[PDB]
Structures are given as C-alpha cells and as structure tokens.
Amino acid sequence: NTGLLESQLSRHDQMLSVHDIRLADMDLRFQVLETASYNGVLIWKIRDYKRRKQEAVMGKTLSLYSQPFYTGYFGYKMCARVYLNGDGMGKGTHLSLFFVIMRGEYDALLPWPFKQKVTLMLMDQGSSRRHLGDAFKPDPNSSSFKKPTGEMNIASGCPVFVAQTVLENGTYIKDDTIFIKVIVDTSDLPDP
C-alpha cells in the first residue's frame, strides 16, 4: 500500500536524521582530537572576539570552554573556561580566565586533590610578545581540585585576569582573535 511506501520513507528520513546528528557529533570529536595536547600545555585560539564579547554582554553566552588537554597520554584531563566580559569581581570590567579539572578515564590512578602548578596567560600577538600571565597553586581544600564527580569540576583561576581596557587597547587582539595559553606543571606526577 502507498501507506507502506510512506512507512518506509518515514523510516529513512528518521534514519537520515540520526546519521546527520551522528555525523555532526563526530565532527566535534575530530576537532577535540585535532586540537588535543598531551604535555600539559594548551594554546586556545578564540576567533570572532568582537562578536563573542557582544554575546557575553547581552548574556547569550557568558563563557566559552576550550578543548581538553592532558598532562600526559593517560593523566589528568583539563581545559580552560573564559568569560569575555568577566565573572565575579571582574564582571563588566575584566576578562576572567579559569582552569577546569575534568573527569578523566584514569582518575582512579592519579593523585588527588590535584596539585599541579597552573600558569594562565594571554598571548601578545604584537611584536614585543609581552604575554600577560599569572600562576597559581591549586587549593587542596578547594572543590575545584578534588577527584571529579561530574564531567568537570567548578572552574577556578583569575576572575580579574586582564582589564578589558588593557586587552582591547593593545596588540593582544589581532585579526579579531586572541590566543589563550595554559601550562600545567607535569614535573611531579608519575613515570617509573
């Protein structure tokens, strides 16, 4: 019956939809993969600063989080979270840069709470390369550096990293894009 033809047509469209989602997801897997890093250093490239900043003000998107980077092929999983228009004591005045401990497939083998030194920083695309950066030491008692429960613990870093005045009136922004860099000290943990 023509109704049976439609039953099959409907089934294919549904399948085609699954395939579309499925395909798109892999696209994200590819990106994450193509942008990964396993030496505890992450260089995050943020394009469309102007737009994204505006979306942060209007409240469409308060923060962006980077792709995950690792301290080693099988160590801590981490990433960065930024608020182009500020968070906490920086909302409206600064750009807040936070570090994020994510749940990793090998957390049952890694030390806790997380204690590696973290250096946060914004690259200076200018010619003098005056990179802006800070370095903290995880707070053992903080819930941001304890063995993960969900996908990622509560971000933690510098709410008052850079003054929006400084950033935008300098050579940190070129081609409508800035680069953020994080450096985890892999110096301590593992290795026979």
Partner: peptide
Amino acid sequence: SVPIQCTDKTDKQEALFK
C-alpha cells in the same frame, strides 16, 4: 598564587569551543 573559584558555577550560559 591562590585560585579564586568561579561564581557563574550556577548559570549554564556556555558554548563549546575547540
């Protein structure tokens, strides 16, 4: 050298970006 949490640990206004 002491990490300050993140207040927005309450709102879910965030976008993936690799």
